[PDB]
Point group: D3
Chain length 248, copies 6
């Protein structure tokens, strides 16, 4: 993507898309994709509970910091980000300095499994499309450690549905495309329970993210993976969900 690395949710604004014959259509599409992505990040924020200006938020696998900047403009709190990409950290910070908020928002190169945050000092943290890259038990044990008792964890992610048995080929094609390891909803809920994380909200967002991918499949920038997403989301083997949980 251009800013947010995650996917979006919500009905597409076809009116603003205009004529696919215009030259500026492919541009008007990128703007739309962004709008839908911002909307889902805004939705993930709605689930962090009431974070105050004095709280410290953590974003595991923060990408370019889009979610961190949004968290700060909304809550006023301090936000620490973490990623494996140096280029991405530098980017997020550069953007913060420019916004005059690098005194609250910072990204750093660090593996989300071995973070520098002290036990029980984080008020809320999240994984926005990044838990598909790490063992679930270990990332949740880490969030649980640095999370304050009563803290809030949120994760928006794609997971294969165990209701239909083993992972469908679609899920595997996506895994191969991103060199990730998509987990099952069973594994998500299991790991959370074994790590003192208790779900407060579990919501399947597949219907809200479908328009996003259908619109994306009609572009130039298409990478060939949008087919896997659309089919798996339709036959139900793959699903987009949001899980907000309390660190009990």
């Amino acid at each position: 993507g251009l800013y947010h690395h995650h996917y979006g949710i919500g009905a597409v604004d076809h009116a603003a898309l205009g004529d696919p014959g215009d030259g500026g259509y492919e541009a008007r599409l990128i703007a739309e994709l962004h709008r839908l992505e911002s909307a889902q990040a805004e939705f993930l924020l709605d689930h962090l509970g009431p974070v105050g200006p004095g709280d410290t938020l953590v974003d595991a696998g923060c990408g370019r910091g889009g979610s961190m900047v949004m968290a700060h403009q909304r809550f006023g709190c301090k936000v620490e980000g973490v990623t494996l990409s140096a280029a991405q950290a530098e980017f997020g910070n550069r953007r913060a300095r420019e916004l005059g908020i690098d005194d609250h928002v910072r990204s750093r190169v660090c593996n989300m499994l071995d973070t520098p945050f002290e036990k029980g000092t984080v008020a809320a943290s999240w994984n926005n499309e990044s838990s598909m890259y790490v063992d679930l038990h270990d990332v949740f044990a880490e969030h649980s450690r640095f999370l304050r008792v009563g803290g809030r964890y949120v994760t928006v992610t794609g997971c294969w549905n165990p209701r239909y048995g083993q992972p469908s080929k679609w899920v595997s094609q996506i895994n191969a495309h991103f060199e990730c390891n998509i987990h099952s909803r069973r594994e998500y809920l299991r790991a959370m329970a074994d790590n003192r994380l208790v779900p407060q909200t579990v919501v399947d967002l597949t219907p809200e993210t479908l328009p996003y991918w259908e619109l994306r499949a009609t572009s130039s920038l298409v990478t060939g993976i949008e087919e896997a997403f659309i089919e798996s989301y339709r036959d139900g083997s793959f699903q987009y969900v949001l899980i907000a949980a309390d660190r009990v």
Copy 2:
């Protein structure tokens, strides 16, 4: 209650309530309470997935069969109910014979922990305000046993929120009132994971059930327990939730 033994959800129809000075007000209130209760049972049904006419549904702790009759009029399937009360079974069946559907809907005196249903033959089952009377691990292990792989379990129940530590006095007052043992959301999610039940939807309904109890606290039939419900729901120590899960 009068028919449904569970509680309701949704905004109160104050217009239909009219003048609390009318003699018929206390009557118009009972009708409203019923409407809200039917609405929540209708909501629990929305989470059973697509049950077909050939499926067999189970209601653990079925009360007077209100949820069973509703399930059948909606899906056309067979519905087996279970309770400890003989008077309640007789009632549910009597109502079925009268509706001319006792060839699909039946209630029987049987403990939900030791049911007669064969392994993997039930398509969907639920606990509507009755899981607060039994050990969670054992009732979920039982549902999991008679539930078909891919089947759907739903539970609407009051649970104390572990986010606020131990059970508040309010929760204990309710327990004493009904001689029940209200569980924690942690225990609900934990038991489900240890019994091959994977939550597909988790939604806090406390805001939707609050109007129900506030309206109830203003009646003659009041039992004195409505205070415990309203306060605990407000300070957040007690919460009303719906959990729909897949038997994986």
Copy 3:
């Protein structure tokens, strides 16, 4: 209570109680209650094993320090107490200064779940009627941490008997009265096993504590809860037990 916050054990000295017609009867009763309470605390001490003058003992949920002062006068060791009540800490310490033993015995405001004691430095610790206020797994994990390998843990507490299924209303009435969360004997034994605590002695003391509550139910100071205790102890749904365990 007046000094010890716990309950007592042993046959009542009716001779010393004299005529319930005397004015001084209600006084002679308080003295008796105290005697029975001291006797049970003395009994809990009998289960700490051979603690030496150089050992450090811990009392989780120490109340007014009665058990701590008794532990020190008997063993000569150092005793650290912990409670949530500032007024109770101040009281215990004041009493220690007066006894000229505040150089061995001290109480402090601290939650028994997050104690300041170093790993493996405590020789023996106990919960005298206070484990009913906290999650069992967490308090036992904490005792296990600061407990020396080979150390001794003791707990005297009321627990609902799982032999009779769910908690009886009596247990719930008590919970509501003290805003506590009485656990099941199953939960006690389970938590101990998951936290390297191995029971050396398990003894039901309900028969020895019954006289205590029957005598108490005949006083002025009665709070109305003595009925719940007596009935539940009689029908067997509630039980008073002592569990001495080794930190293996």
Copy 4:
């Protein structure tokens, strides 16, 4: 031993032992040993709760049926025994026919791990000095299966104390002597918790069984193993205990 295969408890009757110079001393000793053994079996019975005439009791590893005959003469119930020795079964039954109670008491060759008793039909069962011959998790899972909910399990056995780390040589010498596999108190309590068996009474009987072994070490029939028992019981590495538990 002569009848009971287990060990005994209680103070030795030195008066009845008389002069060790008599020829009949070695005989008077066997009679004493028996008395102490009967006394411990009587003690194990005290922990079966109130078994009625219509109950079915099970003895896993029943030896010659001494405990079964005693259970029946006391309760009037039906008692099924199980052992690997055909010669021992035949003996127990022969003794029953003679007592005119083989219509209640029966022994059979069957492994205690794979019993023929139906799920939930046994009221109480026990292992008197025989759990040291089988995996603990498997024998307790079996008792739990055929045990009625609310049933009572009792075991009197020698176990190495984990408070002193690994098994002492003494314990190993005994294991080699009987070709058994003495377990740790930790393993006993652990297995019970993982198999729905909740200890109601745990009592160290080592002091009550010591006189038994000291008297035994002074006989002709001595096998050389009494040294291992006496030393290990004294240094505390080995211990004799009774555990009565409820099948919850």
Copy 5:
């Protein structure tokens, strides 16, 4: 493949391969591939222990029965096969009738997770390249059920190495190619331990199977997936192993 559906092990016979210029080379290659495959199946048999003529062997995910026919010609026992493919069952049986051994060897359409074999009646069973298609805990729980105590389980399979963290893209490409779900060596060993299966032999066969795939990558029949196998086997993210275990 042509007969065996699994992969092979052992040094390639380049001498028998002759000139890649011959027309008959592509034929001489298929014969070689077969030889290597037969050799690995022969190797899996070496790990079934001493199965006698009266034993019943099971092959979960049997393909065309090549391993079953080989097991019978070697041991003389009865061999039951299971697969999801009707065409494959018919094939295996047809081959048995022709060999005059269909009175010992039979294949049937049945899911390896829900088999018809009775508890404890199978002497040895195996998964030859088929465990990558099912949840590991469930297939091993099933083998454990129908496996006699002391029985032997063997599995030859490809598994991603957890020593290198998450699944490499190579593993994902293979998963997508076969629509399977390759597990981690950690998951293999974990599931076995949770299902009473104790490994007696664990051997990495990646070096012995490498020649097999290198020779295969030089053919006409190539499917494009041989690259994924060779690279992942070389960088160590994917590995071919054999695990022989006892049902304890």
Copy 6:
């Protein structure tokens, strides 16, 4: 033994043993025993993976340092040893100073359960015939702690085979002889899985160690325990194995 405290593997060199009539035979035997012992230690090293000069290796229960000196002469790395015997530590170090390598190899008196090594700093560690002296879960949890992610653990040890049920008398005789507590292969594999140790190689070495013990049973130095080893290794109740695992 004389240097290595462990046992050996490999065919006996009868030619070098010469005439058992020579006076120097009993000497030529000790030399042979040593050769076989060095060979097995060399074999354990083959399973540490590619340890580099900058790695730190740990030997839990190091005896006289024979395995440590061998590890260093082969890899060039730093090797820390641990034992309970002061005399053994002094010996290992003395030998290191003499070899001019005490700047890489060191032994110290420390219990392998509570080591001073920092979390994740050790590249590979092992237990050569010493895990039979400690609880398995605790020693493996310790290795896992100080072991780097991706590190390698190896253990060569005698374990009773669970395939034959409970420990045979032979195993018990050995336990009594060394005052150790021989574990079951089940316990070895179980503990490893619960402590993030995943077996890469599991190999029964009983056939390779048998010649070692048969040759030993024909000497003067015989202690009487060689009978237990030979018989148990033959009837299969006891077994010598090597387990190499990765810290995942």
